[PDB]
Symmetry: D2
Subunit: 171 residues, 4 copies
């Protein structure tokens, strides 16, 4: 034989190990329209109608937003927009209510509950009305047969919705 | 009632969805010693003995390297170093061999196989010997009861070892 | 050389592949007490106070129910029971309400919302009162620092509560 | 108000919690052919050629074996069989060797290493030759672009091969 001594500068004692990490994908939508009927005297919504153009999805990532439009997700060619239609608003108090409505994603429709939290009915700058309010709720991908190819392991079945609204009076 | 029109600048149609991502944790060890007996005439290792000071782990992350020393991992107080001892080298050809040896991690010992790939026996700068060679192999955390508290879901049971060596002759 | 022909009866072309499966752990509790104050004239709960003896957990598995009592879960020696105390009941209609209360698990307390669904106020067999009702809600393990050693990957952060009640009048 | 006492027989304090479980999918193949050239005097394989009919997959599950034939897996219509062809056998000793060969799965081909473990060269019942031997190795789904739609989270990238052989002499 023969003996050797390491050269520490060009020797590497290395390892690789695979691990999972859970993370939140958080996105908004840049382009959407709404019809808002709300009566500050009773603090009750009367009509809430929302259309969101899928094309406008923004999850802080160019390449994933594209992939969202594809057939294993939104199918944006065939179904260009998702829609919400209020069917019922059930008042809890002047700050809180349970909003039921029809959500449609990729041409499939389920009724959902959103938690309305009225964040302040004012009469703003110019003496015309403003209102803040939030809508919050969880929906299940499985309920809308969304991304059915993607397992509920890889991507959660649960989608948390957070709609934050400021809104001004008509004309 | 009363009608409102969104202010798009202070309205946000948001969602959150939890997903998993797989990733490789890749680290080395800054401080280790070796005894290397190798016979270039037969290209056979005769003795390979390695001690790696756990304290010197570097996985490009200060806070995780600490956490590696803790009791749910390396137990570096009680077991300050991990060791490899060659028991057998089985030659495939002049470039390749199957090295069997005892690995000890946190005072538990299993025999492993590493794949020796001899990357060039030269006689360098000053007319003294050098050798390159790699040792590659997979070990199972479960075999050494490592991180037993961490599931094989979160962190893989499989650890890939890659030892890259340059090494010079004695005295 | 020499040629051979398989014996198919004692030859096996085999493979192993690791995959994940998501599943629901569903359990009840065999031993618990409650104080129920409810006014059928207004269909409003007035007091709801529940203590559940952790020892009585039943998730259709002997060995896991034990493991639930251990320190990486319930700590049943130190904290023998978990408790719910109603602080608020907010009526939606005669069938529905939003119940807020303090939940304590292993000596940690958070206020929760349960969805009360009144399933029928009758006057039963003997002319004494009965009531059906359900309480439903989701709580987060992280909110109560529960099983903190177990990742939110392996076991979901989300716990769905379903309390199904039948209940009779006093004395 | 009014007070109620639970009826424990028709009251249920329930919970649901989602958790992951890792498990091994283990299958064989019922229908396959082989050409085996082996020289007991030198204990070296000379030729090893295997074709496995995908249709014959058996993973102890009727409905999954079907699903294996589909386009997100084996594509059994277009690619009815997978094949192994030995290109090299490198002897370690009389019991052990490193077999290199071309594996093809769904019309994609990679060279693999299997670990040959010769389990006994005998001359059996009738004075004609038999041989036992195993071939063992890991292959990566990603190397063969297999099940590319299924993530390496849900189903492991790693496939362990275990070929157990008994085999008799010609004619």
């Amino acid at each position: 034989m023969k003996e050797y001594t390491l050269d520490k500068a060009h020797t590497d004692v290395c390892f690789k190990i695979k691990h999972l990490q859970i993370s939140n994908v958080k996105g908004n939508f840049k382009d959407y329209s709404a019809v808002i009927d709300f009566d500050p005297a009773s603090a009750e919504f009367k009509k809430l109608d929302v259309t969101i153009k899928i094309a406008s999805v923004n999850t802080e990532n160019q390449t994933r937003d594209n992939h969202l439009q594809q057939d294993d997700f939104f199918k944006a060619k065939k179904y260009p927009d998702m829609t919400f239609t209020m069917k019922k608003y059930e008042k809890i108090d002047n700050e809180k209510g349970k909003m039921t409505g029809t959500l449609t994603i990729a041409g499939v429709s389920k009724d959902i509950v959103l938690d309305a939290e009225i964040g302040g009915v004012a009469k703003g700058k110019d003496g015309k009305e403003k209102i803040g309010f939030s809508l919050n709720g969880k929906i299940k991908r499985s309920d809308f047969k969304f991304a059915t190819s993607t397992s509920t392991i890889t991507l959660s079945d649960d989608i948390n919705l957070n709609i934050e609204v400021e809104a001004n009076e008509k004309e």
